[PDB]
Amino acid sequence: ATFSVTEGKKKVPVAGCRVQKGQLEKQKKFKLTRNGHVIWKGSLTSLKHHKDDISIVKTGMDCGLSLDEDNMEFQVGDRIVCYEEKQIQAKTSWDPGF
Amino acid sequence: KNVLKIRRRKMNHHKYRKLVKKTRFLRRKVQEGRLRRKQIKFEKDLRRIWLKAGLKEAPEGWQTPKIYLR
RNA sequence: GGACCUGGCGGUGCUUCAUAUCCCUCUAGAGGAGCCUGUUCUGUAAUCGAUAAACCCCGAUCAACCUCACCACCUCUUGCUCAGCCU
RNA sequence: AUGAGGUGGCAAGAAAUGGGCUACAUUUUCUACCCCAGAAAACUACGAUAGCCCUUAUGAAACUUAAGGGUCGAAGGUGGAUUUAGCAGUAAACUGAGAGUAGAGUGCUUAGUUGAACAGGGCCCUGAAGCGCGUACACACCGCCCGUCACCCUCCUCAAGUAUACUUCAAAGG
RNA sequence: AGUAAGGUCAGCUAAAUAAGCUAUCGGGCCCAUACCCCGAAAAUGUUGGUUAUACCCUUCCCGUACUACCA
Numbered sequence A: 001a002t003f004s005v006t007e008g009k010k011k012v013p014v015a016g017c018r019v020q021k022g023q024l025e026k027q028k029k030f031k032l033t034r035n036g037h038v039i040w041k042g043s044l045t046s047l048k049h050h051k052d053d054i055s056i057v058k059t060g061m062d063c064g065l066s067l068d069e070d071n072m073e074f075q076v077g078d079r080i081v082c083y084e085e086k087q088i089q090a091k092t093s094w095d096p097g098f
Numbered sequence B: 001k002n003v004l005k006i007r008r009r010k011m012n013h014h015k016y017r018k019l020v021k022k023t024r025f026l027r028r029k030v031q032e033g034r035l036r037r038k039q040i041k042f043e044k045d046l047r048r049i050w051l052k053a054g055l056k057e058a059p060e061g062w063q064t065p066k067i068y069l070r
Numbered sequence C: 001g002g003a004c005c006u007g008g009c010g011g012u013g014c015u016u017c018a019u020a021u022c023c024c025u026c027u028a029g030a031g032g033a034g035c036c037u038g039u040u041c042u043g044u045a046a047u048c049g050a051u052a053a054a055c056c057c058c059g060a061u062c063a064a065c066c067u068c069a070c071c072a073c074c075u076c077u078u079g080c081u082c083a084g085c086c087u
Numbered sequence D: 001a002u003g004a005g006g007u008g009g010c011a012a013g014a015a016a017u018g019g020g021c022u023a024c025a026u027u028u029u030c031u032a033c034c035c036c037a038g039a040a041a042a043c044u045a046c047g048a049u050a051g052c053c054c055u056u057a058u059g060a061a062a063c064u065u066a067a068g069g070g071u072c073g074a075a076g077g078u079g080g081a082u083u084u085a086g087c088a089g090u091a092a093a094c095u096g097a098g099a100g101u102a103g104a105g106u107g108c109u110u111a112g113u114u115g116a117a118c119a120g121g122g123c124c125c126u127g128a129a130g131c132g133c134g135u136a137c138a139c140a141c142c143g144c145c146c147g148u149c150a151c152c153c154u155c156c157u158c159a160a161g162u163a164u165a166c167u168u169c170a171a172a173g174g
Numbered sequence E: 001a002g003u004a005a006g007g008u009c010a011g012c013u014a015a016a017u018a019a020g021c022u023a024u025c026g027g028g029c030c031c032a033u034a035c036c037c038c039g040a041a042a043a044u045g046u047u048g049g050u051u052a053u054a055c056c057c058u059u060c061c062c063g064u065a066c067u068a069c070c071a
């Protein structure tokens, strides 16, 4: 469900989501998924559950999700995949033959 | 005679006086620190005279005055 | 760079003027309407030139074809010209 | 083929602008006359040379060019800012001819008729002449030229903290 | 969403005669471009009732102020 919350004279679209597999963390980056397409890439502006801010929601926990990008449109069936990004040392592809 | 050589100096002085009014607060800091090295360089010259004359400490009852104050 | 010369200019001075002239002054007009006509924009596959005074019923005392240089299509090759070209 | 020839064809008008013609009428309109007249006269008036329809003329060819007739009877009711011409047989108004074309202009050239008003007082303006002044202009006042704010390029200075390097010491005393 | 106060031309201000000044458009002025000078366009958010007229009343629309309220 998509909710419109009025805080500070600003309409905040809130995406109500149900965690199916895994957990969501405030720090870890997110991306929006529409029927397999990738709509958005970024971090949540506010993670708030049951009127209480929770950093880590476990599997099966209900959580309302608001993005920092107001242009993002939330539908009834959109999917969201959270992910953790770690920089990895890259080695040169050049092999000299020995 | 014309004043084409005065008009060149007219703007030079105007631009210089307008730059000092814009940087007047930074110039007060530089001059204060420029007067601290000038006084310490004066204290080093006097300390070279009694160290090269064979003494170890300044003559009794001698204090180097701050000659770069207001 | 200094000092001169000439010329131009000056919201530069004096004086004297402008006779259809700068202004006021006399007379009929223009800009207002409709039409004719030219030009500029726009448009079209579809000329050119003039274009402040000193262009704008100007070249044209003049375009239905011709004029015609323009456009489209077709055609010819020592070709009206001891060539030709409004390039 | 940037040459030559043939067939067909476009040259329009949302808009703006210049010049001109005709008018908004009663000093007029129509008729007779060519200056002693009678009518008209505001929603059947004044006023289109436009539109539409027909005919005719020229021409091989005309909704198309021009003329005429018929129908039609609009705007317009005297024109903002500004602006043009003209010193006398002139302006204004009226009339005719001609060039050029097969034909074609409200255009041009030209002949004639009737026939005015102001003309005087000034020096900002437009412009001139004479004697002057000034001038950094000379592609000449649409001239020349001064500063702020930009990329790029070049050099210099200041400067916090720190680091390196160099210099001096015995040219001394016990 | 409610409650309060509200609504002009592109803006704004007066009047309800709908005008004035900017913005816009075109013309004029100049050598030309500005300024400037002239003209034209532009409506009273909407429904009617209501009255000279909408300035009154009402319908609906939008925003303003505040609050309810919502992950």
Ligand SMILES: *C(=O)[C@H](CCSC)NC=O
Pocket: A001, A016, A017, A018, A048, A049, A050, A051, A062, A063, A064, E071
């Ligand atoms: C919001 O409160 C959230 C909505 C879930 S919609 C299935 N629920 C719990 O925090």
Ligand SMILES: [K+]
Pocket: none
């Ligand atoms: K001179």
Ligand SMILES: [K+]
Pocket: C030
């Ligand atoms: K007139």
Ligand SMILES: [K+]
Pocket: none
């Ligand atoms: K006219």
Ligand SMILES: [K+]
Pocket: D020
């Ligand atoms: K005219």
Ligand SMILES: [K+]
Pocket: none
């Ligand atoms: K008549």
Ligand SMILES: [K+]
Pocket: none
């Ligand atoms: K500059």
Ligand SMILES: [Mg+2]
Pocket: B008, B011, B012
């Ligand atoms: Mg200088």
Ligand SMILES: [Mg+2]
Pocket: none
């Ligand atoms: Mg032409």
Ligand SMILES: [Mg+2]
Pocket: none
């Ligand atoms: Mg032909």
Ligand SMILES: [Mg+2]
Pocket: none
């Ligand atoms: Mg040719």
Ligand SMILES: [Mg+2]
Pocket: none
């Ligand atoms: Mg009649």
Ligand SMILES: [Mg+2]
Pocket: none
């Ligand atoms: Mg007729």
Ligand SMILES: [Mg+2]
Pocket: D101
């Ligand atoms: Mg002929």
